[PDB]
Amino acid sequence: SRSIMSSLSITLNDGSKIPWLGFGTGTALYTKDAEQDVLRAIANGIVHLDGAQVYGNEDSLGAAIAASGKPRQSLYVTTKLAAVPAGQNVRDTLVTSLKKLKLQYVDLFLIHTPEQHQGNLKSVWKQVEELQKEGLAKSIGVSNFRVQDLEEILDGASVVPAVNQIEYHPYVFKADQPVIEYMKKKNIVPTSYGGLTPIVRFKGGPVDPVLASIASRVGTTAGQSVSEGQVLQLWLRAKGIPAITTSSKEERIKEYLATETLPGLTPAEVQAIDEAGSKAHHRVFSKFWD
Template identity: 45%
Template sequence: MYIPITLLTKLTEMVFSSAPTTFPNHTLITLNDGGFIPSPAFGVGSALYQKNATEDVVLALKNGYRHIDNAAIYGNEESVGEALKIAKVPREELYITTKYDGGDVRTEFELSLKKLGVDYVDLYLIHFPKFADAGGGIKTVWREFERLREEGLAKSIGVSNYGVIELTELLLLAKIKPAVNQIRYHAYNAKENAPLLALAGLNDIVIEAYSSLSPITKFPGGPADPIGERIADRISTVSGGIKVTVAQTILDWLKTKNIVAVTTSGKDFRQKEQLQVFQESFPPLTEEEIKEYEEAGPGWDQQ
């Protein structure tokens, strides 16, 4: 089921606007709790899993990233905290996300704060549904999340890797709706995730996407490749001859759909290239390009 971008925008009723001076390299998306979330986020999972992330995060902050996406299970919250100390970016100019991975919610949350060296986080997510089950069940865990939100310790709360069934269950019991659902999302699984995006849109839940560059990093040679190349050529032309990469078109696809991009790179030029997409002047994809890209090869990553 393909959802036209015009319908998706109408369903979500989200404000997608250029960022204020505190987030000059990002685009902001309004959350259902009245807050906002900057895109892109610099993720310290995947390539930095269980590794020291200090050097990469310091470089990202130097290049203008202000949203850092972390999780307890990544095993590098302390090194991220060290990067924050080194970079000395004012706390109010940072957006810090981390994730709950089981155990007593309050205990685990306070441990994350200590490791990160901050007094609050901007977004706290349940990393996987199974971690809520291990923490006493979704009702128990979410009530604790709501308390953290009410106390201002977590400015926004949400989930990660929740499907339609799990998200529906949560919505039925939540006093405070999740503001975000972070999922694995790319061209080859976009079509199967359309019902999940529709449910999120109806409840003003922002989608965050990780592994979105998979068509070129993990599954090269697929049917999305030539489409991405054509889009890159088109945007390069309308941008005055600036050479646009296929990776940038993928991030632009997320931006056009009001989806927060979670991406990472330890390379200076890649970080700058990725941030360039989120400037107001970077042209969006057309509705036709979005449809063509998402219908290129559903399930190709399972070939």
């Protein structure tokens, strides 16, 4: 049965392994849908589940884990700090998350965005470092942090964030080159959300014929049909960047799973996607980056 051990994973700077393929509750409107989506993801073999405080779906993620019958120790669970409610501290929010998730610890706890902690980034990160010492979060990281934001929290830090979860796909490749290079020097692993943006929101752009050509190649090598969407995930796999996905259709979930083991892209293929993506800038989330 699929588990963290039995799945493709990426090693973090603290020694632990995060599964390369993840599934996120995202901005799912109804918790009833969110629960069924996570159940579908676990049942089809995804073992990395991404939640957040701010969208209220931790309860459904916890209920789905309990209802799936899969041992919690087989699964990697992430959640993310929203704004700190008045009269509370960071630890208070994680205790609340863990009660909703029905867990004793999360595998990964992230600051969801620097925009919610303006003037307090150093303080918040120190609090997150203490939550790792306390045993409530195995690994700690950030989300949507620019180079400027990382410099701020790294000044006088005892722990370097294990990951920076960001929007990442070919249409932000050119703009993100500085933060990607910075993270590589500090050994911060980027993780991707929004990986299918080019073909879901901007179909008809310059990357499409490149994806079509590469999908035909990968499919010929593998002996099965391969989609443009699967090539976008192989692009992330080739860069060592975990892909957090969002679609709930069992047919698409099975497509995602296949990308874990499809033939990898060659250097010329990755470069061709980099180039074609660099012909357009389309940033869908965290617009303060622009």
